[PDB]
Amino acid sequence: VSYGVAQIKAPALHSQGYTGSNVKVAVLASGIDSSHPDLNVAGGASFVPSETNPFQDNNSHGTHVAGTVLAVAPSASLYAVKVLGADGSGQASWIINGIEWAIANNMDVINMSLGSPSGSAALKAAVDKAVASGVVVVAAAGNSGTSGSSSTVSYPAKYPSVIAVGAVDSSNQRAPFSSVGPELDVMAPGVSICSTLPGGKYGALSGTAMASPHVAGAAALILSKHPNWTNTQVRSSLENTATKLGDSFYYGKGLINVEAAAQ
Amino acid sequence: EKKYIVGFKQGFKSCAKKEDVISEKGGKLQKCFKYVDAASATLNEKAVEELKKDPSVAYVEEDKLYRALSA
């Protein structure tokens, strides 16, 4: 497991008996590799035309991301929603197809560890629709560092309906790459995060892509303890109970604290 | 560069209705969305111009690339 699990205070939930059982988390990424003897991928679908197997991860990031959701929430059910190919990229339309899948298939949480400096009206429609459907929608805030006074939050994390997750180290210091702006909602561990890789491996990856699933995992923990809270209530608990770290421009509401968010 | 998303106004909910507007203008449908009021399509510059001007169409935008936020 990773350092980040204790950092966000997930073990307090595990102790109470809440580990995310019966909570469905869709990982919208490069696939999740069947290479692992434990990720309990309960399903999935691919929307990359030339890469039809959601259980083949030829990039590595989707597998790492899934592993992190699971290190926070051990009994959650993961779904492999392949919307990025081997090179780590996807068209807006493939991602929308992934989000619509998650909606149709009654996913509780969407994780999107992906970004673009530019938005798409259709993609804003999809995330907004998912949120109106009761889905907790989480995204990596971007890895574009600082650009004057300007927001460097990527899309879809930049949309109001989406929880935008920046990256801190094990010291609770913002990573130098972590995107900034008014759109930044919370922080989670995103530097040298140890997680599952293809070919049955494990290793460190860094990025807001690593921070995002700590929050997706936290949302699953909260929902397993409180199945009657809405997505709005889950999101608000995460934001309102976060540990303040400094300026909202750099850290949003600060570091998520799952123990405090869940009562 | 020639991959687009075509958004629709009210009353174009079925794929068949979306597809007919796009084809009437010389475009090629890729996928109709289920909740979002839009469809992906491949369009040349003439088709883009004509769709934008069509009263059925809310927008035409590039089907742009998004990337994993991981090193």
Ligand SMILES: [Zn+2]
């Ligand atoms: Zn534990």
Ligand SMILES: [Zn+2]
């Ligand atoms: Zn494993």
Ligand SMILES: [Zn+2]
């Ligand atoms: Zn946001």
Ligand SMILES: [Zn+2]
């Ligand atoms: Zn409760």
